[PDB]
Amino acid sequence: TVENFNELPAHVWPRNAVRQEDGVVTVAGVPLPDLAEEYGTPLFVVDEDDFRSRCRDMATAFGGPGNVHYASKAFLTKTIARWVDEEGLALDIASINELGIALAAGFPASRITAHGNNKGVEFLRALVQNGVGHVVLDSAQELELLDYVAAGEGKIQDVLIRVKPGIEAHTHEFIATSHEDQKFGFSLASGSAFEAAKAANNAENLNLVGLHCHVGSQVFDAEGFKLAAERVLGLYSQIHSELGVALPELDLGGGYGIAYTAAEEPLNVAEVASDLLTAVGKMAAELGIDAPTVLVEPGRAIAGPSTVTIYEVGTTKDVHVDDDKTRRYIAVDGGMSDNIRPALYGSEYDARVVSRFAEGDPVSTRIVGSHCESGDILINDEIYPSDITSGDFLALAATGAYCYAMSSRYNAFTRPAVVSVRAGSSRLMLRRETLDDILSLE
Amino acid sequence: TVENFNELPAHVWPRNAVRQEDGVVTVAGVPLPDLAEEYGTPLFVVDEDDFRSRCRDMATAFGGPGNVHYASKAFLTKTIARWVDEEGLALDIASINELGIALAAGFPASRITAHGNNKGVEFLRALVQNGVGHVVLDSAQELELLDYVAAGEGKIQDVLIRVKPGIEAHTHEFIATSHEDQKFGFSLASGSAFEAAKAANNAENLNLVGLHCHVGSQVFDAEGFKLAAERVLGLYSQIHSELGVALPELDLGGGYGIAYTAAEEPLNVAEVASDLLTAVGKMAAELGIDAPTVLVEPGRAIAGPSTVTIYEVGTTKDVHVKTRRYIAVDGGMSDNIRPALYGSEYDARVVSRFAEGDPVSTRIVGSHCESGDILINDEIYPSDITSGDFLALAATGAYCYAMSSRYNAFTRPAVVSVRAGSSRLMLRRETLDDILSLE
Numbered sequence: 047t048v049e050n051f052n053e054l055p056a057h058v059w060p061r062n063a064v065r066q067e068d069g070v071v072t073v074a075g076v077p078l079p080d081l082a083e084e085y086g087t088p089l090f091v092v093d094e095d096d097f098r099s100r101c102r103d104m105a106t107a108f109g110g111p112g113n114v115h116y117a118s119k120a121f122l123t124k125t126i127a128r129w130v131d132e133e134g135l136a137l138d139i140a141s142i143n144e145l146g147i148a149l150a151a152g153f154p155a156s157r158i159t160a161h162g163n164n165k166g167v168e169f170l171r172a173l174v175q176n177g178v179g180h181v182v183l184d185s186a187q188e189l190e191l192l193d194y195v196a197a198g199e200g201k202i203q204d205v206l207i208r209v210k211p212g213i214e215a216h217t218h219e220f221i222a223t224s225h226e227d228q229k230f231g232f233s234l235a236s237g238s239a240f241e242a243a244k245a246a247n248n249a250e251n252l253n254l255v256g257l258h259c260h261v262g263s264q265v266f267d268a269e270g271f272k273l274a275a276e277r278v279l280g281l282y283s284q285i286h287s288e289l290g291v292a293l294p295e296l297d298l299g300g301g302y303g304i305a306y307t308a309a310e311e312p313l314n315v316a317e318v319a320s321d322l323l324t325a326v327g328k329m330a331a332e333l334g335i336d337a338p339t340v341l342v343e344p345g346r347a348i349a350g351p352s353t354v355t356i357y358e359v360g361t362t363k364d365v366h367v368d369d370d371k372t373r374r375y376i377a378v379d380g381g382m383s384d385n386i387r388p389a390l391y392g393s394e395y396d397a398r399v400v401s402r403f404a405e406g407d408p409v410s411t412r413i414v415g416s417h418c419e420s421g422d423i424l425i426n427d428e429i430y431p432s433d434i435t436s437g438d439f440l441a442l443a444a445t446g447a448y449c450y451a452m453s454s455r456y457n458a459f460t461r462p463a464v465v466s467v468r469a470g471s472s473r474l475m476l477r478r479e480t481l482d483d484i485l486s487l488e
Numbered sequence: 489t490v491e492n493f494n495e496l497p498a499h500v501w502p503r504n505a506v507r508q509e510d511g512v513v514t515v516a517g518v519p520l521p522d523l524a525e526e527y528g529t530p531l532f533v534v535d536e537d538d539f540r541s542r543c544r545d546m547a548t549a550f551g552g553p554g555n556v557h558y559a560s561k562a563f564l565t566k567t568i569a570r571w572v573d574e575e576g577l578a579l580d581i582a583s584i585n586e587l588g589i590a591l592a593a594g595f596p597a598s599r600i601t602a603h604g605n606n607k608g609v610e611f612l613r614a615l616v617q618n619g620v621g622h623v624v625l626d627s628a629q630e631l632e633l634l635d636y637v638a639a640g641e642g643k644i645q646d647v648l649i650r651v652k653p654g655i656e657a658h659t660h661e662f663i664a665t666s667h668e669d670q671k672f673g674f675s676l677a678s679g680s681a682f683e684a685a686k687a688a689n690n691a692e693n694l695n696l697v698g699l700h701c702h703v704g705s706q707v708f709d710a711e712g713f714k715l716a717a718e719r720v721l722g723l724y725s726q727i728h729s730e731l732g733v734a735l736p737e738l739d740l741g742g743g744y745g746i747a748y749t750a751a752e753e754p755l756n757v758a759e760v761a762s763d764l765l766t767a768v769g770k771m772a773a774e775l776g777i778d779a780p781t782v783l784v785e786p787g788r789a790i791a792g793p794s795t796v797t798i799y800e801v802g803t804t805k806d807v808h809v810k811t812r813r814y815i816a817v818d819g820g821m822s823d824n825i826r827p828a829l830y831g832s833e834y835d836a837r838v839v840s841r842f843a844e845g846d847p848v849s850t851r852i853v854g855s856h857c858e859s860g861d862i863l864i865n866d867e868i869y870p871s872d873i874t875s876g877d878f879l880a881l882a883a884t885g886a887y888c889y890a891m892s893s894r895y896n897a898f899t900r901p902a903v904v905s906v907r908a909g910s911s912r913l914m915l916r917r918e919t920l921d922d923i924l925s926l927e
């Protein structure tokens with residue numbers, strides 16, 4: 047219905063977003079159309095307080111901000127790093143450039159954890175030389191090369207080892223296997239993970255402080271995380287009984303969900319965490335080991351909901367799909383260059399007109415970008431009012447995770463601007479790219 | 489076999505690529521490993537003469553360079569625009585920034601054709617002010633807005649109209665329908681396209697010179713293009729009989745294929761063009777209309793084969809699934825999204841030596857922290873490929889760099905060209921400072 051389209055699902059949209067009585071959407075009191083006019087479109091708008099409130103939710107649920115690592119892969123800038131730093135969270139990075147951005151912002155290295163399946167010697171030296179607190183080891187070669195690097199610096203590097211527990215956790219199910227056919231870490235089932243823990247134990251310049259797993263995506267309950275934790279704690283028990291070694295930490299990774307569409311439920315992090323951490327304590331007590339400090343690495347569930355992408359609506363057309371059915375195509379000014387996720391993953395977003403209330407009869411609609419490719423589709427098939435037209439401002443919710451980070455210059459499109467909002471004012475976070483930026487590489 | 493892996497399939501690889509006796513692959517005389525050492529990895533290497541020779545192939549087949557439009561969307565830099573200019577080709581752009589690149593390179597605007605499904609007023613004004621030769625109209629709104637813009641400038645803008653003929657041409661089939669459920673252009677089956685042609689003709693500041701269609705991807709024969717052309721020429725006949733209007737040009741778009749893997753055959757442009765062009769002339773005679781000048785818009789088939797992407801091999805690991813051997817390289821889905829996005833299959837080779845190991849099921853992955861960052865999904869390659877080897881993927885000259893991202897803050901790779909035993913930097917590698925500059 048037209049009424050349903052003119053709603054604003056509060057569990058999807060940023061926490062400080064409101065539908066005003068004239069149809070305008072504000073975020074932190076700032077009207078979205080005014081941002082679109084000031085900064086241009088497409089535009090990412092970041093509800094700063096939303097982001098910080100997620101940090102806090104997580105910190106309370108997991109027994110302190112230092113147990114929560116923000117997964118920078120979702121979205122990292124100097125501003126984001128500072129927000130994380132101020133909130134007391136740890137920061138996970140996965141490349142030399144994510145480390146660069148974090149160090150540029152003055153994020154303390156002792157609070158950084160480093161990931162990556164193919165860390166080279168330059169990265170590893172940078173990590174050791176800047177005193178990064180943890181490195182998560184992904185392979186035997188890395189374990190040997192980091193031990194080398196660390197010896198060269200006269201340092202002992204605290205490490206976790208990434209293990210594959212054979213659990214893939216999703217929204218409605220988890221999938222359990224003995225073996226995981228993917229590039230990361232060491233197999234639990236085969237003995238490889240234990241052999242890596244022995245290698246880290248034998249190493250003169252590494253200090254093993256726990257194991258890590260990352261098993262989830264769009265997860266809203268603890269059942270898969272629990273089974274992963276039980277499987278990995280089985281290895282803790284073998285490490286204790288066979289090596290005499292106690293591990294103080296257990297990093298159970300990320301994958302906490304957010305609601306992308308109105309029909310989905312938001313995450314109840316308090317409930318999930320309570321379930322998970324109660325289970326981990328019970329499991330530890332059963333095996334006769336110290337209950338480890340549980341670390342988590344949410345990306346999506348810290349950054350996603352805060353951010354929306356505003357577009358200007360452009361061309362509209364009715365397209366007959368057969369003799370009897372019509373699909374209404376609405377073009378927006380960006381496309382798969384600022385949100386590749388519909389095309390790549392089949393991701394479904396919530397779209398709203400943020401500049402007015404719509405009044406037209408609802409009709410089957412497809413929202414497309416401005417790229418010269420037929421798969422540049424943002425919203426594949428929804429029923430939206432037929433009056434959405436050129437000059438309307440149309441926004442997609444929950445674009446603060448992965449969307450900007452995966453942005454391209456396809457068709458020489460420029461990366462959009464990113465602005466934060468708080469207390470009725472806006473601040474530029476990242477400037478829009480220009481033609482000159484594109485040409486600068488020549 | 490090991491012997492098969494140590495080959496270099498000439499019909500996939502750039503035309504001036506050669507496997508030397510020590511296993512090292514050179515392109516235009518320049519050893520790929522030297523380039524990797526000099527410019528770092530990942531590295532795009534463009535065989536300049538390959539690119540030019542494709543242009544020349546296309547120009548001969550379609551009756552002169554001016555009838556062949558390079559589809560900039562495949563890859564555009566000022567250097568590429570200069571090559572196209574020099575080869576006598578037309579240039580197709582699809583955004584104000586593709587226009588900007590072309591104009592910064594001094595590419596003649598009269599030789600530019602502008603595409604896009606959602607052209608804004610600023611782009612349209614730029615096209616008209618700079619004197620771009622053709623605009624391809626995509627919607628009723630664009631037709632009315634361009635006529636207004638062109639009036640504002642005191643110019644008459646030559647246009648084509650994009651039509652949907654209900655044909656999708658692929659490698660092993662074509663698909664025919666009465667309607668195409670996509671965003672571009674005007675339907676032929678409803679009469680919408682006819683009404684657009686009438687409106688453009690009637691417009692005081694638009695000059696209708698033809699219709700356009702783009703129907704293909706990875707096409708190696710003319711059968712789909714022919715039926716598209718017949719369906720569009722039927723509309724030409726209706727325009728002649730119902731409006732009295734003759735159309736001198738017919739733009740049949742792109743979609744010409746390249747061979748990505750060894751098993752695939754290369755495109756025979758001369759044969760496909762001869763088949764299509766002969767058929768167009770025959771259809772025009774049968775309908776009693778002027779045979780139009782046929783325009784084509786290859787992207788992939790001009791730029792793709794010229795270019796390889798060189799990686800440095802890093803981490804190797806055996807993973808029990810039977811065992812799959814995982815080889816990591818230093819780039820990934822940030823420099824080639826096509827395997828993840830489309831399922832695209834590439835040819836990988838070690839370019840720094842001959843391999844000697846027994847062949848095993850292998851997967852080549854990138855360095856990003858996502859399990860889907862896979863570049864080669866399932867191939868049987870020698871088990872001795874190892875850290876420090878240079879491993880290249882062929883035919884990366886179309887779409888790969890244009891679709892590149894800074895995921896995990898990875899920097900865009902450098903692009904170098906090679907010719908006559910020398911290398912020239914085309915695009916420098918991005919740096920951390922480039923990323924930080926937006927702050």
Ligand SMILES: *Cc1c(COP(=O)(O)O)cnc(C)c1O
Nearest residue numbers: 117260300301302343344345346
């Ligand atoms: C992806 C990832 C996380 C977070 O994923 P989200 O779904 O965004 O929470 C944490 N740790 C690692 C190693 C990852 O790869």
Ligand SMILES: *Cc1c(COP(=O)(O)O)cnc(C)c1O
Nearest residue numbers: 559702742743744785786787788
């Ligand atoms: C994609 C495209 C071409 C060329 O596609 P290729 O497969 O690279 O040849 C030409 N014209 C238009 C409008 C296109 O969208």
Ligand SMILES: N[C@@H](CCCC[NH3+])C(=O)O
Nearest residue numbers: 418419420705826830887
């Ligand atoms: N990179 C895509 C898009 C180009 C074709 C459509 N313009 C491909 O693999 O074909």
Ligand SMILES: N[C@@H](CCCC[NH3+])C(=O)O
Nearest residue numbers: 387391447448857858859
């Ligand atoms: N689905 C996310 C990636 C999650 C990363 C998991 N290791 C995306 O858009 O890339």
